[PDB]
Amino acid sequence: NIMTLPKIKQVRAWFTGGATAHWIDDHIATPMSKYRDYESFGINVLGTLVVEVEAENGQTGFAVSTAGEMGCFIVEKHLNRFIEGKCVSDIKLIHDQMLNATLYYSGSGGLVMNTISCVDLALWDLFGKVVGLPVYKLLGGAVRDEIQFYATGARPDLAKEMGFIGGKMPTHWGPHDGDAGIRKDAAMVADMREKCGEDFWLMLDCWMSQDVNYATKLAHACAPYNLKWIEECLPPQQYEGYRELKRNAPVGMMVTSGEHHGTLQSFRTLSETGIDIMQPDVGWCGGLTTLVEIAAIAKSRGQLVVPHGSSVYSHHAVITFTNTPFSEFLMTSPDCSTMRPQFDPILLNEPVPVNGRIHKSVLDKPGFGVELNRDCNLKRPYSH
Amino acid sequence: LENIMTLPKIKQVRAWFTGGATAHIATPMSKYRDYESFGINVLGTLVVEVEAENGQTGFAVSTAGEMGCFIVEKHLNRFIEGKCVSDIKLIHDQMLNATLYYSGSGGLVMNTISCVDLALWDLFGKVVGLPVYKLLGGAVRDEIQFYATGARPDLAKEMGFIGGKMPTHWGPHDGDAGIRKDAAMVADMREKCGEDFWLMLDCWMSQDVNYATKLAHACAPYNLKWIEECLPPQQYEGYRELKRNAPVGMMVTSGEHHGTLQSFRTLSETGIDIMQPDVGWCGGLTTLVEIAAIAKSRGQLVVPHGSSVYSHHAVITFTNTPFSEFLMTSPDCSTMRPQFDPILLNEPVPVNGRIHKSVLDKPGFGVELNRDCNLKRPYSH
DSSP, X not given: OOXXXXXXXXXXXXXXXXXXXXXXXXXXXXXXXXXXXXOOOOTTSSOEEEEEEEXXXXXXXXXXEEOHHHHHHHIIIIIHHHHTTSBTTOHHHHHHHHHHHSHHHHTTSHHHHHHHHHHHHHHHHHHHHHHTOBHHHHTTOOSSSEEEEEEESSOHHHHHHTTOSEEEEEOOOOGGGHHHHHHHHHHHHHHHHHHHOSSSEEEEEOTTOOOHHHHHHHHHHHGGGTOOEEEOOSOTTOHHHHHHHHHHSOTTOEEEEOTTOOSHHHHHHHHTTTOSEEOOOTTTTTOHHHHHHHHHHHHHTTOOBOOOOOTHHHHHHHTTOTTOXXXXXXXXXXXXXXXXXXXTTTEESXXXXXXXXXXXXXXOSSBTSOEEOTTSOOXXXXXX | OOOOOOOOBEEEEEEEEESSTTOOOOOTTTTSTXXXXXXXXXXXEEEEEEEETTSOEEEEEEEOHHHHHHHIIIIIHXXXXXXXXXXXXXXXXHHHHHSHHHHTTSHHHHHHHHHHHHHHHHXXXXXXXXXXXXXXXXOSSSEXXXXXXXXXXXXXXXXXXXXXXXXXXXXXXXXXXXXXXXXXXXXXXXXXXXXXXXXXXXOTTOOOHHHHHHHHHHHGGGTOOEEEOOSOTTOHHHHHHHHXXXXXXXXEEEOTTOOSHHHHHHHHTTTOSXXXXXXXXXXXXXXXXXXXXXXXXXXXXXXXXXXXXXXXXXXXXXXXXXXXXXXXXXXXSOSOOOTTTTTEESOOOOBTXXXXXXGGOSSBTSOEEOTTSOOBOOOOO
8 A cells, every 4th residue: 555665776966056166245244354365265165966866767856055176075075875775755864974974074064064955955855755745744744834934135125115024134243343333234234124013023144143142232222223143243153152142132022043953852952051042954954854953943932933045955944833923035235125935946946936925836846846947057976 | 662563464374284085992883893994193293384475384284174274265365354363353253153053163174273273373473472381371380291192002091191092992882891891901000100100091083971970989998090082962852960979089081082162161061071172173362261261160171182383372270280291103102203303393202201381482373384295275265
């Protein structure tokens, strides 16, 4: 009676862009801002990793992430031994073998975890396509008919005109800029509030570029404008810093972090610091398998989990979380004015929000519902 | 006042790799009957060489391999070249912050940053004409005393070491039998080594709190000095609980797989007795020295992982490190073979379980690169 499932025959890894191949390129505050010559620091060195898992029946599944050539090394020279020969349904098993087999060098996040994540996603894609169901249905179905999005870019006013529920702006100054920096980023928020109205959400992303005092001053300077939350003020290792910041945050204003945190255990620690919302990235936290466990601990705490925007990889997950009432969409547009697929053009048939939402019928396709665009500058650095 | 010594700028940095996938110890993978193999030798060795504008050079080695060469040749080089040979701390900070978004605060990327830091210190010392340990403020003891890591503590004792660290052979899935066997192993070594010789167990991230607690107590009757790295590095909370349940007087340690100063701050606050950073994984010498300081500020010892000359020059200057580690890379653990043999030339080894400082009295880390190894240059710039 049971549906026959094939075994996985092989896994392949390619990379595009990177070392060995606009608003975001405009004075964005980062951990490197401290340095004038980097106010450049190689934010695009990794490039994109694409992992394809082929089953013994010819069916295939894939996923993409940030890892590039080095990611292909990890996949082609190490993880393949835990992937090939497995059942297409041995997703959790492969995931655990990967985490434990690379524990000694993964550093619980970053490059190696992004790679493990990509594999996990490619396995889920394959399984769903083998079964004939969208990932969100395999996970237990949607808990809402559509996903509502806030947009990340420099123009919250334009995002509002486009139907989004909010807009997240990046900070432009850091600790070394002192009171002037705070004054300028705060004024920026004040202006957007003026232009967007009261009900449209505004958020600040600080991309690990501040310390507790600067972050505290910035949050309070923005409190008069009802900033919903202040995101990733500190490097991910500074859990203690996050606990202190949260305690000094304006009442009602939320403190969030997590896109650069990896492994379930790290999120357990992060959650205990008191921050309001953890923001794991499926492609960095360990994959879908890990993301779903992270959602659960936040829920066990009566807290929301709001994953980083990862296109279809995130959509299929968040639509099933009773714990994620909204999601994120990155405005990869130079001026932030058009709806361009996030992973364009590597992904074919990638959906985009319409009126700030994506209905579930849109996700009703096998696996993650997209196909690999093999006309990209895909490179095969290693084989096995 | 005399004229300041003129220092050259670094001209270029190059990286090679030897070993790697492109050239019954308990582990986290032990639970799988097919890996109890799991690719523990996939990375290979990374060698970084920094050349100054005057032709002088400095280098260091670590675990990163080909991928490490990618990081060095395609990213970090921009923060290294053109700098003064004395801009060590600056380069170190630029590297940490420039790779923060993908380093994961440890592992592969940190091992790479570490290797660079060490190569820079090697260069600077060789340019100045002083051993690294003198640049750091001098030795605080005349010799480094060592305990040995291998399966034969009894042989290590005969060789003059102050102790012997054995690895565990079973884990949580083996239950009471596993505990019984590893405990008996310790009991036997105690019998053969006497009372004053130290015995330690390395668990290499393979246990959970309950198993570790039972194992420590089963070994308490034999005065095990400490139980090392029982849990994965992210489990700080686990370490706090384990420490609270550890036999009184028995120490709990960890740290060889932890990276960045901030992580060590967190680790130290769990209550564990001794942190064991590895210069080649924690971030480099620059970071190791800061780690030593927070342990000292706590009135605690810091005992770095054994990293040959890279560790020696650091630990001999720490009033906080009364002893160090030497790995028995011998199949049976019976001979004194240089740890990084043969990649390192003129690498010293302990004699009577010690290495006098006069042995370290050479420029930088006092060793030279053996260019007759299977060194590969995967990338250039």
